[PDB]
Design an enzyme around this catalytic site. Sequence first.
Site, PDB file in Angstrom:
ATOM      1  N   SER A 199      -0.872  15.622 -11.948  1.00 51.02           N
ATOM      2  CA  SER A 199      -1.143  15.255 -13.324  1.00 51.02           C
ATOM      3  C   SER A 199      -1.396  16.520 -14.137  1.00 51.02           C
ATOM      4  O   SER A 199      -1.929  17.504 -13.625  1.00 51.02           O
ATOM      5  CB  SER A 199      -2.352  14.324 -13.380  1.00 51.02           C
ATOM      6  N   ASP A 223       0.820  -1.200   0.000  1.00 48.32           N
ATOM      7  CA  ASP A 223       0.000   0.000   0.000  1.00 48.32           C
ATOM      8  C   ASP A 223       0.860   1.259   0.000  1.00 48.32           C
ATOM      9  O   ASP A 223       1.354   1.673   1.047  1.00 48.32           O
ATOM     10  CB  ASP A 223      -0.890  -0.032   1.240  1.00 48.32           C
TER      11      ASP A 223
END
Length: 330
Positions: free
Chosen positions: A199, A35
């Site tokens: 992004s 994770d």
Amino acid sequence: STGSATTTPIDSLDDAYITPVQIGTPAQTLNLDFDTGSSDLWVFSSETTASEVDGQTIYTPSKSTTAKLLSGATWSISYGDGSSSSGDVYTDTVSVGGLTVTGQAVESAKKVSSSFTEDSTIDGLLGLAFSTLNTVSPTQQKTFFDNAKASLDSPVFTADLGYHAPGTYNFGFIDTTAYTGSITYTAVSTKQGFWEWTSTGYAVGSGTFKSTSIDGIADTGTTLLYLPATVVSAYWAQVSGAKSSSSVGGYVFPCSATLPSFTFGVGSARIVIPGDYIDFGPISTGSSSCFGGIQSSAGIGINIFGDVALKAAFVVFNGATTPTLGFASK
């Protein structure tokens, strides 16, 4: 040194991935959920409340000659999905894919929430976010990667998750055969303890690319792609009959649909998520309403590039002095 381990979807939907991890001496192999959005290595154990264990493999520290109680240390964690666990701490030898760390903090669960009990395939979590998020008290502990880093050939790990198929976690090297083209690297903020990046935009299907900054985290422990409501609405608007369902808890779509792809930007590069990656199947057995793999982050407080996004790429988690993230197509 290096390590390389295969990671395997737990079910036909790729709801999560499990990676075998050797703990203790002799080795006890547990299948952990790696994770990159948390920083605790915790396991089902011989100390876990018996009624909260249902099919998991447990770590028994008393059977490990290298286990030592980390005296006074406790831990307690709550995840974004509302699940939680807590307990005490041992140090022991932990190996992943041939890479060994001695003295790793292994957090032994005394209690786990129902979601963990109900998932027989996950024996615990191995956190790969920054150690500043580790919950051990009163002495915070380091992640497996943080402990291994100085020994690695290069201070990196890579995630290569498969779509409906196994993939690979590598430690200490970049497998140049595992991706196509070049890797585009992008800046990371560690201020919130995550692999947080920005992004450069998105496209829906064959549509035009929208240049827009989207801050979010690269999180292998989250199944879906969680993005701003504007972006998510633009995606689902291209699927006839798709709608946000408050009762179901997100966007659903007719199972008869053909889903468009979704593209996200990494600098000037583009990662394309095929439409099929966005299908999470019937909301309940036999239903013709299917659950979407792109959902709104509104009310999470952060955008999350979970498995839906990451499995479309070869992803480099660069733990150099100034960390960065790399993405390549594959």
